[PDB]
């Protein structure tokens, strides 16, 4: 944190509302993931490739 001269580093830079955009990109793609998981489960439940027992 302290340089050679004894001075102090500038401000640790943040981003444009990082928490909100991280949440707003992690949650809908989570929904797309569970949707395509259900869709793949039905798609090979139709054929005999599935394995629930």
């Amino acid at each position: 944190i302290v340089t050679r001269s004894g001075a102090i580093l500038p401000k640790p830079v943040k981003m444009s509302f990082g928490l909100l955009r991280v949440f707003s990109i992690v949650i809908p793609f989570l929904y797309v993931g569970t949707l395509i998981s259900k869709n793949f489960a039905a798609l090979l439940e139709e054929h005999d490739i599935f394995v629930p027992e």
């Binding site: 050679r4 001269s5 004894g6 001075a7 102090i8 401000k11 640790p12």
Partner: peptide
Amino acid sequence: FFHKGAKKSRFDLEKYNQLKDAIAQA
């Protein structure tokens, strides 16, 4: 946290870390 306390108490951090470079140079 130090920059938060700097914006709180307002102690001229720019003058301070300029003067550190100046005193090390001299």
